[model samples]
Target: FVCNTCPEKWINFQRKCYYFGKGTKQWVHARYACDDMEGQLVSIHSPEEQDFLTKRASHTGSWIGLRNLDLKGEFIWVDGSHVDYSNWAPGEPTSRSQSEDCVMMRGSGRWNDAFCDRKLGAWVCDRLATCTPP
Candidate 1:
């Protein structure tokens, strides 16, 4: 069952609670920020969840838990899961530069690879919500 309750300022959806960051930060810092709140950067899995965040971040853009730091060709989430689905923008993951390894979602709902420390934008965090006892 789904839970309606979430912490202050969080958006509850399905079994997860999401928090959108108000300010900007580098990808690494953004990930750490999420960790500070007991969650990791948002890990997208399904189209529905992706669309939800795509709409939520349509204005400021946001960092997700996708990066290719280790394998260069293999992108992984903060939780160490390989990407099962992706929504990369055209010509993305270009590996345009040596530092372009972090992923960010553009306002257009497309993904791009950018410098881990160069990209500065808001972020989203996600953690499992506590289901209400039925």
Candidate 2:
């Protein structure tokens, strides 16, 4: 029973490795960072996982993997999982415009909508844990 794995400086939680890093990029480019790392922008599913990421989130802000890019009012969790929970901040996702399709995770652990082309200073990447058989 020893499959927990992660790279240096990345936090291992459950079966995933998450990284919060300093960066300058719009929401679209944000995914690019994670993509290059062989992961995806963090997709929050449960309260426990959310809490884990909340503390490590950048003080300014960070990008998450939810977006309504395909349909303006419907969000698609990039991980392609069931939509069992949502943690939108009060009056969040206010921007009804198509450009505000991306989601951002504030330092407070609340999510808000952000224009896809706008730049944020913080970003996160997460992927399944690399495994080693026992």
Candidate 3:
């Protein structure tokens, strides 16, 4: 279940979890999927979502709200903003296997990527609600 204070919970249009499913696509492809649905993959802007995802994803490392689009390990955020912040796990995301491009939410409230895929977890996306803006 989504947390009450979770912004993703508020933005869900279909109320579905594991929003990205187990697709073995590249990060860019996955991103396109969200865009085709009129949204992009989730981005974490609050400690609540971060904490919730961190715990809920304890077992298997789950995807979170960051990516490297420039191939420079520099993230161009979903909102077209530069990222100067990160929470990588100890000795993790070391570009393991030479091109690790995805992030997994760790229970320790950090991130890791060890040539991992097939993650079963929830994701977030946003689209303009039909209702008038609040």
Top-scoring candidate (lDDT) = 1
Model 3 C-alpha lDDT versus the unseen true structure:
0.52
Best-to-worst ranking by lDDT? 1, 2, 3
TM-score of each: 0.89, 0.90, 0.54
TM-score of 2: 0.90
Q: Each model's C-alpha lDDT?
A: 0.83, 0.83, 0.52
Best by TM-score: 2
Q: Which ranges of candidate 2 are over 4 A from the true structure?
A: none
Sort the candidates on TM-score, descending order.
2, 1, 3
Candidate 1 on 30-112: residue-level lDDT in tens?
99999999888999998889888888884767888898865555888888888998999998778845634888888877899
Task: State how far residue 67 of model 1 sits from its true place (Å).
Answer: 0.3
Clashing pairs in 3: 18-122
Q: Give the 10-residue window scoring lowest on summed lDDT in candidate 2.
A: 69-78
Which portions of model 3 show Cα errors greater than 4 Å?
Answer: 1-26, 55-58, 69-73, 97-100, 107-109, 114-134
Task: Give, for candidate 1, the lowest lDDT window spanning 10 residues.
Answer: 92-101
Write the number of the candidate with greater lDDT, choosing between 1 and 2. 1
